[PDB]
Design a protein around this ligand. Structure first.
Ligand SMILES: CC(C)CCC[C@@H](C)[C@H]1CC[C@H]2[C@@H]3CC=C4C[C@@H](O)CC[C@]4(C)[C@H]3CC[C@]12C
Ligand SMILES: CC(C)CCC[C@@H](C)[C@H]1CC[C@H]2[C@@H]3CC=C4C[C@@H](O)CC[C@]4(C)[C@H]3CC[C@]12C
Ligand SMILES: C[N+](C)(C)CCO
Ligand SMILES: C[N+](C)(C)CCO
Lengths: 333, 333
């Protein structure tokens, strides 16, 4: 159902470009005058054992056994995704690289002597770049999900998905990163005022919670766009309804996946960091291991969230019949 | 589509009854040892004029003209409902009566010398009785809505709907009044602590807002149950989706209906209270007029909320075709 590429949002692409031009004008105006990645596959067996031992020793928890089984099954499929797409795990370094290049440009142009372009620019463009990662991962994962066999592009993560983002759907990302910018900046202003006084803790924490809610929603909205190739509002509303109807499954996947994945990166970098010391003192190895383990499991979580929404859409439409077959793997629930 | 009466929820009916028995045990254990109702019809013409004059003298508001037209049309139909059901306006006095009888029992049994049954009892049972009013009104209004002609029970509000609540759906109300009880009591505890200190204003106000959100949702869930005759969770989820998809219409109906209906009761009791004084001092007439005008327009608002959800369901299903006709009145939008 993926063979429809309709660009979906143009006004917000134009606003993003026009802003970037205005920022460039101000710039020029003042100038001219030992890895943990092993977990990406094996963590699918560790997670099932972890649950198995935790529930030994109370039994009211059994009503959730159906919801945890889904969470575990999704991790198994996520392992298959990274096996099929060897380049996917490395994708965060191109995002980091791009962020650095922008940040160096930003800080260098701030030195030349309107100012609101640099304050808004820094935040909006950085969120834009990060939101582009979310669309890019969802594209590659969706392509895998809806392929019924082993035939694909040899290097799908760099041969596909990014081409669709830049050619068609770049406007959809622009709108989403703008919406979150309108929240991230007010929160920073309140934090500044608070420290200069000090009773703003409640309103600052509320906006912080809002940021997480909007981010999660945007990530699902981007995936829904990649599948249905519609505009932002339609994708966000469709994904929202699915998240509400399956809210019990979303809460389980996010609470259990977070606990398990947290132990994943923490336990493996503790083991790696203490290995080979033999009573010799540096901790630079421990910091390295933390940073790479975090970026590897961060994108791992993204793949699981995309697979969940793909499953839900694969049951809202395309039900079973002699002429209709599911795109899902053998995950029956 | 209303000919299906399936009881919908039994476990929460049993829990409600078992609690009431436990409360009765504790009781016995310690013992044995000039009206404003004219508005119910004419307010449908006053509302349209009020909007007409307010928009004379800015024009950005015109984008909402489609949403206000719906709000006005719903008020017109609400007038028809009260004309067809003359007994409906008087219904709040039986709710008040029932609340008094319980409250007298409660306070009398508190005097005999476990205590948690009286604290939880007072709140849960009172919300139960009030929630029963919400189901009762929705039943009568839904019956009118889905009747295509003038044939009905002569005294439908007392001949129907209450029979369905007591015979089938009493368990559905029990669950809803329990959920709101779990919020109303913590809020009261925080208010108590605050006055004995004083920095709890934020968390108290948040719970208060939550109470209004849950109440509104429950009222729509009860109406959805009356139509679809399903269980609470299914009705609440279905009504929730409709409220989100039409959120722009809900915000308009609640913000404009509240402003107009507020003026309705306030203006008419001011006029009645100052009438016939002729320089004669009592204000007991003004208080009487306020109290009756409030209960009359409170149930008026309930009828409008039920009609809105009925309209939405009448367009989600039962679309136009040679074999399908809408149940709605001539409200085309
Ligand atoms: C309008 C003109 C002047 C500027 C256009 C800039 C475009 C081409 C830039 C801005 C943001 C960039 C994206 C930001 C982040 C990533 C993640 C990375 O892992 C792969 C490349 C990818 C997906 C980039 C591709 C190129 C991109 C879309
Ligand atoms: C279990 C046994 C002993 C007691 C059962 C008591 C039941 C029948 C009582 C308790 C609360 C009552 C409801 C409380 C309030 C109202 C509002 C009124 O406008 C119509 C009747 C209605 C909807 C009542 C119907 C009867 C009711 C459901
Ligand atoms: C970070 N999670 C995705 C696990 C939860 C967001 O609410
Ligand atoms: C009281 N209203 C129904 C008007 C609004 C509730 O949020």
């Amino acid at each position: 159902p993926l063979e429809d590429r309709s660009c979906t949002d143009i006004p917000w692409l134009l606003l993003f470009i026009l802003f970037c031009i205005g920022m460039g004008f101000i710039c020029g105006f003042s100038i001219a005058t030992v890895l943990s990645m092993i977990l990406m596959v094996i963590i699918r067996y560790i997670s099932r054992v972890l649950v198995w031992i935790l529930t030994i020793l109370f039994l009211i928890m059994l009503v959730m056994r159906k919801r945890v089984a889904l969470t575990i099954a999704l991790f198994h499929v996520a392992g298959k995704v990274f096996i099929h797409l060897p380049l996917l795990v490395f994708q965060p370094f191109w995002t980091f690289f791009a962020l650095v290049l922008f940040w160096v440009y930003w800080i260098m142009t701030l030195l030349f002597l309107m100012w609101w372009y640099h304050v808004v620019g820094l935040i909006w463009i950085s969120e834009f770049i990060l939101a582009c990662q979310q669309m890019t991962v969802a594209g590659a994962v969706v392509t895998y999900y809806f392929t019924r066999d082993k035939r694909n592009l040899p290097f799908t993560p760099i041969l596909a998905s990014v081409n669709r983002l830049i050619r068609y759907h770049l406007g959809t990302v622009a709108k989403g990163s703008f919406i979150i910018t309108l929240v991230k900046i007010p929160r920073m202003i309140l934090m500044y005022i608070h420290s200069q006084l000090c009773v703003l803790k409640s309103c600052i924490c509320c906006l912080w919670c809002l940021e997480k809610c909007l981010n999660y929603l945007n990530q699902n909205a981007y995936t829904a766009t990649a599948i249905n190739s519609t505009n932002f509002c339609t994708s966000a509303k469709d994904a929202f309804v699915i998240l509400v109807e399956n809210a019990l499954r979303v809460a389980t996947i996010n609470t259990v996946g977070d606990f398990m994945l947290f132990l994943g990166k923490v336990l493996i970098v503790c083991s790696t960091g203490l290995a080979g010391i033999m009573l010799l003192p540096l901790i630079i190895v421990c910091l390295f291991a933390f940073l790479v383990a975090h970026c590897f499991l961060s994108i791992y979580e993204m793949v699981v969230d995309v697979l969940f929404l793909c499953f839900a859409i694969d049951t809202k439409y395309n039900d079973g019949s002699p002429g209709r077959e599911f795109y899902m793997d053998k995950v029956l629930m």
